[PDB]
């Protein structure tokens, strides 16, 4: 983000960059002795060793070409997206008093990249813009189809079967499980319509038999002259031989 937001003239700022450089090497197993003292003015040789170590974290088993290092190192920084140019000549004079401040800054920027990368490695999409839901499953299927296609085809029935199986489990639906309840819920509806018919025949056979037992009750009350809830005992006045003798 040109510009240099960094105070490369502040000795305290540089010394602090040096300290980070020192700490990172010591704490991440750099194979050579380093110290605040040894990093005040490194040689081109030691610089190249330190740089090979660091860039190693982003390009495993990297080693620098035995020629044209003045071109490689800046190109490497450029491609990593370092915002500031590294001159061909500063490479030749890395630890010199007007150069080291710029280089150590670059190294400390490289260390931050590494920290970022390192992090997004330890710590570690099912909807798609085309309209695919359950993308992880679709990807699994597409991949398996592609590999098959890869070899011979042009059928993917193994794949389609496996996919069908996984869709059966994910939705719990079968052409059988759906059909089973189809006749199963139809079976109790006719039975409910049949249980309705019992309760409908129970209404007419109750209201007609209670209307028929009342007429017989009137027939007994008139013939025998007896009401329960007596007459004709020579008065027809309201009130067996105990009642007839009084």
């Amino acid at each position: 983000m040109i510009k240099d937001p960094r105070p490369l003239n502040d000795k305290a700022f540089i010394q602090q960059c040096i300290r980070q450089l020192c700490e990172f090497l010591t704490e991440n197993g750099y194979a050579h002795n380093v110290s605040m003292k040894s990093l005040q003015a490194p040689s081109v040789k030691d610089f190249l060793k330190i740089f090979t170590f660091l860039y190693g974290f982003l390009c495993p088993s990297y080693e620098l070409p035995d020629t044209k290092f003045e071109e490689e190192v800046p190109r490497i920084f450029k491609d990593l997206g370092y915002p500031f140019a590294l001159s061909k000549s500063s490479m030749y004079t890395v630890g010199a008093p007007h150069t080291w401040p710029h280089i150590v800054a670059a190294l400390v920027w490289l260390i931050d990249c590494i920290k970022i990368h390192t992090a997004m490695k330890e710590s570690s999409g099912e909807e798609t813009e085309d309209g695919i839901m359950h993308n992880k499953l679709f990807l699994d299927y597409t991949i398996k189809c592609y590999e098959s296609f890869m070899s011979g085809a042009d059928s993917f029935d193994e794949m389609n079967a496996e996919l069908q199986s996984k869709l059966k489990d994910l939705f719990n639906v079968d052409a059988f499980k759906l059909e089973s309840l189809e006749a199963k819920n139809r079976a109790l509806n006719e039975q409910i319509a049949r249980l309705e018919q019992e309760r409908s025949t129970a209404n007419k056979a109750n209201a007609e038999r209670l209307k028929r037992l009342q007429k017989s009750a009137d027939l007994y009350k008139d013939r025998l002259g007896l009401e329960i809830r007596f007459t004709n005992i020579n008065p027809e006045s309201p009130f067996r031989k105990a009642f007839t003798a009084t």
């Binding site: 491609d79 999409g125 592609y146 939705f171 719990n172 639906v173 309840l181 819920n185 009750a217 007994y220």
Partner: protein, 219 residues
């Protein structure tokens, strides 16, 4: 089978069609692909490809991880894409039938190699397009019959939840029992008829009290 190998000219058309959208597609030319691919363009392409295949937001490629620990977060923007590209591209290019993709290919893209990588990606995109059709068909057959089991549990549990005289009888039964008689209902239009012996009384030519007395004399 190795995958088909498009020429640069055709690669631009397929990328426009399938990967780069609107202004990004319009701006693409052979020049930023050959003979010196342009890292910034390739980054765009790989990101789009990944977003299409895996469903990953563009945002995700510019994310500064938690307790980062970096001095100047903002001097880091040029590097961020790369970190996120590598991890996905290591997994994705093998799928496209590419097995020798290396970080250098992201940082500093070479002509002949990125052409071969682009054809690998493009061919996979066409294939999944074909796979999408058949998958989606299967995914509207199973999810549709799942809708037919929602309605099949709506009509089943509702009709499973719906399924989830002691005064007039004893009065009309005492008459029958204590008297030991029952009427015949063939008692003509006026007379009284029943069984106890057969009882047959006229009633038009007989008093009420005579009938009562005759019936109780048999008890």
């Amino acid at each position: 089978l190795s995958f088909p190998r498009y020429n640069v000219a055709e690669i631009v058309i397929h990328i426009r069609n399938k990967i780069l959208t609107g202004a990004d597609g319009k701006n693409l030319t052979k020049n930023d692909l050959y003979p010196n691919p342009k890292p910034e363009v390739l980054h765009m392409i790989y990101m789009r490809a990944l977003q299409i295949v895996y469903g990953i937001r563009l945002e995700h490629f510019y994310m500064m991880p938690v307790n980062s620990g970096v001095m100047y977060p903002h001097l880091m923007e040029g590097f961020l894409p790369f970190s996120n590209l590598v991890t996905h591209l290591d997994s994705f290019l093998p799928i496209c039938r590419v097995n020798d993709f290396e970080t250098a290919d992201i940082l500093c893209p070479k002509a002949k190699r990125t052409s071969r990588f682009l054809s690998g990606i493009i061919n996979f995109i066409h294939f999944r397009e074909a796979c999408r059709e058949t998958y989606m068909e299967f995914l509207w057959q199973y999810k549709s019959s799942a809708d037919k089991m929602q309605q099949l549990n709506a009509a089943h549990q509702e009709a499973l939840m719906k399924l989830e005289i002691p005064s007039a009888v004893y009065v009309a039964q005492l008459y029958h029992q204590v008297s030991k008689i029952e009427w015949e209902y063939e008692c003509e239009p006026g007379m009284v008829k029943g069984i106890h012996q057969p009882i047959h009384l006229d009633s038009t030519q007989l008093s009420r009290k005579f009938i009562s007395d005759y019936l109780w004399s048999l008890v």
